[PDB]
Design a protein around this nucleic acid. Structure first.
Ligand code: VIR
Ligand code: CL
Ligand code: CL
Ligand code: CL
Ligand code: CL
Ligand code: MG
Ligand code: MG
Ligand code: MG
Ligand code: MG
Ligand code: MG
Ligand code: MG
Ligand code: MG
Ligand code: MG
Ligand code: MG
Ligand code: MG
Ligand code: MG
Ligand code: MG
Ligand code: MG
Ligand code: MG
Ligand code: MG
Ligand code: MG
Ligand code: MG
Ligand code: MG
Ligand code: MG
Ligand code: MG
Ligand code: MG
Ligand code: MG
Ligand code: MG
Ligand code: MG
Ligand code: MG
Ligand code: MG
Ligand code: MG
Ligand code: MG
Ligand code: MG
Ligand code: MG
Ligand code: MG
Ligand code: MG
Ligand code: MG
Ligand code: MG
Ligand code: MG
Ligand code: MG
Ligand code: MG
Ligand code: MG
Ligand code: MG
Ligand code: MG
Ligand code: MG
Ligand code: MG
Ligand code: MG
Ligand code: MG
Ligand code: MG
Ligand code: MG
Ligand code: MG
Ligand code: MG
Ligand code: MG
Ligand code: MG
Ligand code: MG
Ligand code: MG
Ligand code: MG
Ligand code: MG
Ligand code: MG
Ligand code: MG
Ligand code: MG
Ligand code: MG
Ligand code: MG
Ligand code: MG
Ligand code: MG
Ligand code: MG
Ligand code: MG
Ligand code: MG
Ligand code: MG
Ligand code: MG
Ligand code: MG
Ligand code: MG
Ligand code: NA
Ligand code: NA
Ligand code: NA
Ligand code: NA
Ligand code: NA
Ligand code: NA
Ligand code: NA
Ligand code: NA
Ligand code: NA
Ligand code: NA
Ligand code: NA
Ligand code: NA
Ligand code: NA
Ligand code: NA
Ligand code: NA
Ligand code: NA
Ligand code: NA
Ligand code: NA
Ligand code: NA
Ligand code: NA
Ligand code: NA
Ligand code: NA
Ligand code: NA
Ligand code: NA
Ligand code: NA
Ligand code: NA
Lengths: 7, 237
RNA sequence: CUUCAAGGGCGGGGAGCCAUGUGGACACGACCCGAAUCCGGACGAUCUACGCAUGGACAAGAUGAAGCGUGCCGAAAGGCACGUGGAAGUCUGUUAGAGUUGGUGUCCUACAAUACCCUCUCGUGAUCUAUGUGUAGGGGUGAAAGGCCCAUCGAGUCCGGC
RNA sequence: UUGAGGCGCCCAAAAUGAUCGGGACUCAAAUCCACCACCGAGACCUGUCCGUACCACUCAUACUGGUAAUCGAGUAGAUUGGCGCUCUAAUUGGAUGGAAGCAGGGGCGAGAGCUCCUGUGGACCGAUUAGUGACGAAAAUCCUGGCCAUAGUAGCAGCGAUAGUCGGGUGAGAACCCCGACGGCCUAAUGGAUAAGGGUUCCUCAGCACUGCUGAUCAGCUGAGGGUUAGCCGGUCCUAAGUCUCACCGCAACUCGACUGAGACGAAAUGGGAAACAGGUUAAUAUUCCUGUGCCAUCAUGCAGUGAAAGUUGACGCCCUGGGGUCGAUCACGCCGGGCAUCGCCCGGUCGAACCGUCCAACUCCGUGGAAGCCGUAAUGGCAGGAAGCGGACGAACGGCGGCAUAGGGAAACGUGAUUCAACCUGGGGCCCAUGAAAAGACGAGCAUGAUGUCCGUACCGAGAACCGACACAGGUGUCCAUGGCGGCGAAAGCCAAGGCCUGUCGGGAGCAACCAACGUUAGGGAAUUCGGCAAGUUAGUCCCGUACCUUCGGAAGAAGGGAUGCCUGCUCCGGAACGGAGCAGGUCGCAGUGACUCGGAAGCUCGGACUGUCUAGUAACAACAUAGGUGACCGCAAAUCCGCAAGGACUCGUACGGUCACUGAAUCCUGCCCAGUGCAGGUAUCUGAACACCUCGUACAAGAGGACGAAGGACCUGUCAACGGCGGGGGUCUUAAGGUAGCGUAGUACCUUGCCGCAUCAGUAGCGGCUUGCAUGAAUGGAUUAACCAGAGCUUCACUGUCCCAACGUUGGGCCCGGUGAACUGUACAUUCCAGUGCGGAGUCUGGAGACACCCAGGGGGAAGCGAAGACCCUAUGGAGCUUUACUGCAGGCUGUCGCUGAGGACUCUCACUCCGGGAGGAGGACACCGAUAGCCGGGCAGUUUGACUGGGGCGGUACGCGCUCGAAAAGAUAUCGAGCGCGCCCUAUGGUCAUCUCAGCCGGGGACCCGGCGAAGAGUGCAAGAGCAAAAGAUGACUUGACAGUGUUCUUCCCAACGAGGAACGCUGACGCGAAAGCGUGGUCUAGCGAACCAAUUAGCCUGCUUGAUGCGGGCAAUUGAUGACAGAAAAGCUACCCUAGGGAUAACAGAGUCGUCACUCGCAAGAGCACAUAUCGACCGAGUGGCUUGCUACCUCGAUGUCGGUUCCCUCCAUCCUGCCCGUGCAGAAGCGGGCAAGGGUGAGGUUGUUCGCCUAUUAAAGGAGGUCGUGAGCUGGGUUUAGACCGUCGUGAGACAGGUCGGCUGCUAUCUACUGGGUGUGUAGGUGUCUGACAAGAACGACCGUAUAGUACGAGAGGAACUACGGUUGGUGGCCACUGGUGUACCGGUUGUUCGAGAGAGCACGUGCCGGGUAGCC
RNA sequence: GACGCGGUCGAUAGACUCGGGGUGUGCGCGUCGAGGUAACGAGACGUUAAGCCCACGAGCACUAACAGACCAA
């Protein structure tokens, strides 16, 4: 939910 | 949205309250059946945590020990008087009627016997101008001409500690220490720095108030912020 | 019935009522599960935010403010030198303690639902900290990030409306 | 010579392995013309059977007979007969001679399912009929339970705490239970004492089923017993912030609520406080028990005393500092004991309290004295208002001294002095816009003797196993020990005591491989790496010398740079002295003297924020927030601001030098113009402006209508921008008020853009400077500038280096093998795949081929659009929420009028209610204010909601959202698209109606007016699109007229077929009319567009009707007209979300795929043209034909219960449209150098500077430094610079939330491999006992590619300049395989030097991270 | 796991001794030593190509390759 999984 | 800071204030929580339990005295003029026979001797000059100005410890003939709003000049040993006949020197307190016009006065009463209300901050002083059998016009430190009952008691001289405002705080820490001894939440976050939800000036991708700052007097708490009922703004013109 | 009139509408030469099964409709949970809500009353400041009360903590070193002194110079004002002094939201500092920049390292079914190592910042102050205490849910608290209010926050949690 | 036809050829380039399905086929197994015979469905024919329908017979839907060429497939769905389950009832049966259930088996039925046999089981079970219903499962990421694979797999290694080993003891059993030795670990903790919290965990005995990361004889485990002793330690008492209770008051009410009053509560380490010490003792308590000694309080008695309450104490902040002084530590010497054994050193001990008595330094004061310059301090300071000196009063320690003590303790001695001095005591100084508790208690206030002194707590842990964190959790968790030794500035490192521990609790084995984690060292080069020097490294302590720009004069600054540094011998100086400090001379060792350890890399330019500080607990520490400073606003306190429903409250123990509300954000230089809009505020003739009362009308009253008066507010006017904001276009004013001043400028703001010039570099989208027309800078939305500061952004230099060229060796822990322990993720099934094809367009499973014996070990992760998470993007839903506003609607609140409280005599006096000030007397105020009620205005402060649909996704645009015409429309009717052309939302009293008279456009002739004649079926005209109609008229002219009439229908249309309203039309009737001789025409305009529901109002004529009844008023209704809903078959309605949320969708976008190929790339045909002449050496327009699938676009097939982005990197394969290399052809080919073309994919195609970039620009090298495919190959490989979350800034836009196909700083990369795949390693089976040697089907290779030089030759060729080749040689470069004599690296084998510390020194050793550091280095590996 | 070699008819491994190598001159003692009354004394020279050390080679049956089990047409 922050760009790449899971940043 | 959420209540703004001015609304949290009113609730009277710890954060917004003044450290009363650390305050020395509720400076108020003494009472006297009449006569004026009352007089005492200055015993000490103390620091008043509520006003950042000195207060004088006085001992009266009837063995009464109380702190007083120390005008400038009063020192230990000195003798002060309180009554319709007290002498007309600095430190003594007597009704405006018995006070000669053109004499700086401090801690003036608004209603005779209320113990003093006006002009009691560092260095300030009122100015008795006009006498009468009814009115005793006094010019308060704000410049206003206050018409008063000549029976209202007052102290001669200017309040001690004048000039306090001249030296800058220089650093946040100094402010911090002062603010800590008052009924005030500090530091102050600018409305325009908050989220819309928190203040009418909050929001935006940049910092600026939403609408004009001058707000109607009829505005409801929660919206009355910025320049309250300003008759004008700016310096120009 | 409408209608000068005319023409139209509705009705008319005796079949229904009740019961039982069953088809379908409408209201209700309405074939069953499935989600983000909204509202009510309660329980939470053992976490954390901010304030208050009462206690506690900060090796060592550096720099050397004012003030004071001695000497020289000057009519004086005052100047210069040296010393004394020991100021500071001052410096160095893994003192204690507080914090958390990079390694985008280790870990990532972990030692751990936020850890480990090195690196790094502050370290007499707007400092850090224990205990006590206050503020409660559209309300607090917020040096403001929509941050925080017990792993829960652009409106906590529990149960209820359901 | 020419025409035509057939088959073929050229044209003809693609990515893992070629293809007609494959093999393969050539007088065919191809092609075309005929022909012959066959094969081949469930079709067709045919036997039997079944169902269904119908016929005959029948009560029958039971039999029996008959008919079907004209019956037999089916999703959703309608209809119908039946099977099975539970329990009820009626009728009727079975079972211990064995019921139900279960397992295996036999029979029947199309089937649901029925039944039998054998075994098991051991007590219930059916049938028929009629009922009953929590009645039938393969599915729901369904629920619960159980279970397999996973797998004997991961974990029991990683942490600066690496810990053990040999003997022995006990035991059935011992790596880990115990004893000894040896070896280690912990030093503010891994020691000692405790708070909270736990709660018995403590001690003993007995145990091992549980728990313990292995085992266990051990245990915080299991069981049973036992254990906590107080006048003097805590609680208890006191009061703190503050809390509760009662009263009072509020509230509809309370378990609610503020104030006031009274009461109580509120501190166990760590606030205040009456009093206890020493030793001994238990398995476990201990200032508690025991022994000794001491002390406090109260009380009783006795003596004393009559004092006694004033005062002192309790009792207090931060910074500096002096003096007194104990323990500790150390020095000296003596004594006792131990250790060591070349020396004479080294370690330990040398004790002894509370209490009672006594001593008193500092401070203060007194007498004397009499300083005019002296006294005094570390410093400040002191004095004729009396200095020093002298005497004296008061007066301290947890300290000295005596006792306590022929007490206690010690094996013994059972010391004495000194220095530095924690504790403790007592002083001096400085700071505050900060002022640093209270109360109980104590003292004041004597002594003897005796008595009493109850109640509660007391164990143990206090943490890498007793607490919180689900765990014996690497996390979290307060206090006192800060004085143990060396070291050194040090509470630092390192080493070592005391004390603790070997439980940060699984072990054994392999020079121990690959690979990984931590780390050491690497020659030459030295940032070439990379977004970026990320990571690592360099530097380092102390002293001496020396130190730039700039600067707010503080700083910059440890700038920079240079030198020194050890040991030994003998000394000097400072000081009372130190086991303190500063130096001197001589001698002397090493590569190295802060020898280890500790321990800055430095310099410059630019951006930002002034600084310290704050922040997103858990991806953002920043430029964001704060700050001082600047500024504006409000308010005289019965205030402004704010909280409460109220009673009431914060600010406020406050008072303008205040405090509230905002903006800006240190200093310095400054801060221009604009009041039109919006906001706020002031004013206001006039206009507007609600309700009550008042007047008129109305009504026997009332509803209701109108008037008069008119508050705030608005209109209007003014003020105000450090108020929201604005600061252009045009010309030598215009919008809308002004029209950008100082500055600054390609900016964190500049699209163009890598702007131009310069600096710098070989090369610089960077950086800096200048210019600057600024897409779209600019003054407290603060502008410019700026010293200092910074885990902030960018750039340069020196230094440094494994970041790199380019990797190697080593060290430690894993990894691998063995014993023990022992999970999880995941699983529709099947599964040895590979190349192709096909398929819903991205297949292990389909089709064709190829390959393939089984099982197992290790590996790195290609594929399973791998695992994990019902996609966050996008759309959709008459979903949610947070937020905004001049969206809709309301609700608080503020202002204002009116009524009540409320009283006496459009302005005024008064006092008596009421309010406030005052202790009270009494003062102020006063019918106002407050309060209750109502009305008008303002009113995102708050609440609920809305904010449509269509659409080659959505948005923007548009409206194909209601209508009419032509075409599309395929000659009936119907017919779509954001299809083509274009219109309607009216207009007309005549432009309607009838009748009479008449014939038009245009052209010709005679006198673009008018008159006459002729031609003239229609091109005129007919209101308006388009199509259509019309000539004795539907047109023109004239006249007359109102049928544009009322009522009610029929039919068609709207809506083909085929239901649906309003609307429309055609055609009637009834009534009344107009015109005409009359037939007849007129239901508006020649026809098809010009339109609107219910509710409500107004209106038209008559009538019906309103609660027992009559009258009046005012209502309710039948029929109809008018008023709008254009989203036009009718809701009353704006936005943001990057803070987001849910339901879903591949119904729909973004990536990729797939189709297409306009675009893009490349080619071909024709060949104008030019190339001095010459198309074709070379270049090559137009036009035409294509190939590819790299670009772009289109489409919306695949995927939204997830196929991870760009770029880069690494590693592998491929294509050819060939850049180089080989062999060639042509030339505008003399040669040399080129140019164009052909074959050709074997090999090669490299290094760097700016930029995230791909692309591209640039540099120097080069044979050349080609292009493209592999999910734009490659994230279960890496990277994370850009895109693309949450924070922030700038510009632009917006009222605002907030937005941007603008820029900028910051910003977490998950998973143990089941299958398949390949690289290597084994075990088996097949060929059917063995050893040794071979063969070679096939397989792999680039095993080799390229360049330079010499001779040829200064030759051929050439006027000359210039300048080849065949061949033969030498070497270089890239690649490849191997090897270590040589050179080089490593080399925690080894040897040496040396620092600190410890073993007394010496000798010889340990530790300093897995070598302390330094020097050398064998083998091996490289 | 596999592979290779040796196994007394033996040099496969270890010990010992040589050889071949790495360091760089051992402890002790003697002389010198700036000095110092002496005590004491950093260090220098000699003894000492010393001492210490070796993952290689050789010699050498001293020690251990013993004992013996199994499968197999
Ligand atoms: C891994 C994944 C999906 C895949 O299983 C399927 C695909 O590959 C298809 C696909 N995905 C995409 C384009 O095609 C694509 O671009 N995705 C995947 C990578 C970022 C965005 C994306 O939306 O980023 C948007 C920005 C464009 C605003 C924001 C940040 C949203 C992120 C979001 O919800 N991520 C979920 C992940 C989905
Ligand atoms: Cl202030
Ligand atoms: Cl049936
Ligand atoms: Cl206690
Ligand atoms: Cl002093
Ligand atoms: Mg997100
Ligand atoms: Mg406060
Ligand atoms: Mg007061
Ligand atoms: Mg601020
Ligand atoms: Mg913000
Ligand atoms: Mg708001
Ligand atoms: Mg700003
Ligand atoms: Mg601003
Ligand atoms: Mg707490
Ligand atoms: Mg000094
Ligand atoms: Mg500091
Ligand atoms: Mg520091
Ligand atoms: Mg935000
Ligand atoms: Mg059928
Ligand atoms: Mg029966
Ligand atoms: Mg099913
Ligand atoms: Mg496995
Ligand atoms: Mg160890
Ligand atoms: Mg025990
Ligand atoms: Mg036991
Ligand atoms: Mg109490
Ligand atoms: Mg206490
Ligand atoms: Mg004990
Ligand atoms: Mg105890
Ligand atoms: Mg443990
Ligand atoms: Mg190197
Ligand atoms: Mg580079
Ligand atoms: Mg590079
Ligand atoms: Mg670094
Ligand atoms: Mg001396
Ligand atoms: Mg060093
Ligand atoms: Mg810049
Ligand atoms: Mg800052
Ligand atoms: Mg964070
Ligand atoms: Mg930071
Ligand atoms: Mg961070
Ligand atoms: Mg300010
Ligand atoms: Mg700021
Ligand atoms: Mg530039
Ligand atoms: Mg301005
Ligand atoms: Mg994948
Ligand atoms: Mg979904
Ligand atoms: Mg979105
Ligand atoms: Mg909503
Ligand atoms: Mg009052
Ligand atoms: Mg709202
Ligand atoms: Mg609702
Ligand atoms: Mg739509
Ligand atoms: Mg038709
Ligand atoms: Mg007509
Ligand atoms: Mg309506
Ligand atoms: Mg009307
Ligand atoms: Mg409609
Ligand atoms: Mg319609
Ligand atoms: Mg969702
Ligand atoms: Mg689709
Ligand atoms: Mg070719
Ligand atoms: Mg090839
Ligand atoms: Mg790719
Ligand atoms: Mg590629
Ligand atoms: Mg991959
Ligand atoms: Mg990944
Ligand atoms: Mg992985
Ligand atoms: Mg990034
Ligand atoms: Mg960047
Ligand atoms: Mg960025
Ligand atoms: Mg076989
Ligand atoms: Mg070591
Ligand atoms: Na804003
Ligand atoms: Na809701
Ligand atoms: Na709390
Ligand atoms: Na000085
Ligand atoms: Na850290
Ligand atoms: Na809430
Ligand atoms: Na509920
Ligand atoms: Na069917
Ligand atoms: Na163990
Ligand atoms: Na004493
Ligand atoms: Na600081
Ligand atoms: Na900081
Ligand atoms: Na204006
Ligand atoms: Na204005
Ligand atoms: Na501007
Ligand atoms: Na390295
Ligand atoms: Na794989
Ligand atoms: Na929300
Ligand atoms: Na709508
Ligand atoms: Na109709
Ligand atoms: Na093509
Ligand atoms: Na990539
Ligand atoms: Na090639
Ligand atoms: Na892909
Ligand atoms: Na990538
Ligand atoms: Na990744």
């Amino acid at each position: 939910x922050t760009x790449p999984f899971x940043x | 949205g959420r209540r703004i800071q001015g609304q949290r204030r009113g609730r009277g929580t710890s954060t917004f309250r003044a450290p009363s339990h650390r305050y020395k005295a509720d400076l108020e003029h003494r009472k006297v059946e009449d006569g004026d026979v009352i007089a005492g001797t200055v015993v000490d000059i103390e620091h008043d945590p509520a006003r950042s100005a000195p207060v004088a410890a006085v001992e009266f003939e009837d063995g009464d020990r109380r702190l007083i709003l120390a005008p400038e000049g009063v020192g230990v040993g000195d003798e002060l008087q309180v009554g319709v006949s007290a002498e007309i020197a600095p430190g003594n307190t007597l009704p405006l009627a018995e006070i000669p016009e053109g004499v700086p006065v401090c801690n003036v009463e608004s209603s005779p016997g209320d113990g003093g209300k006006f002009a009691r901050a560092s260095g300030v002083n009122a100015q008795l101008l006009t006498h009468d059998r009814n009115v005793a016009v006094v010019k308060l430190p704000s410049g206003e001409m206050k018409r008063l009952d000549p029976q209202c008691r007052a102290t001669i001289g200017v309040v001690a500690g004048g000039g306090r405002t001249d030296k800058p705080f220089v650093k946040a820490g100094n402010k911090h220490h002062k603010m800590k001894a008052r009924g005030t939440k500090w530091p102050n976050v600018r409305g325009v720095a908050m989220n819309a939800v928190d203040h009418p000036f909050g929001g935006g991708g940049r910092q600026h108030p939403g609408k004009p700052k001058s707000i109607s007097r009829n505005a409801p708490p929660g919206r009355k912020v910025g320049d309250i009922a300003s008759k004008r703004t700016g310096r120009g013109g």
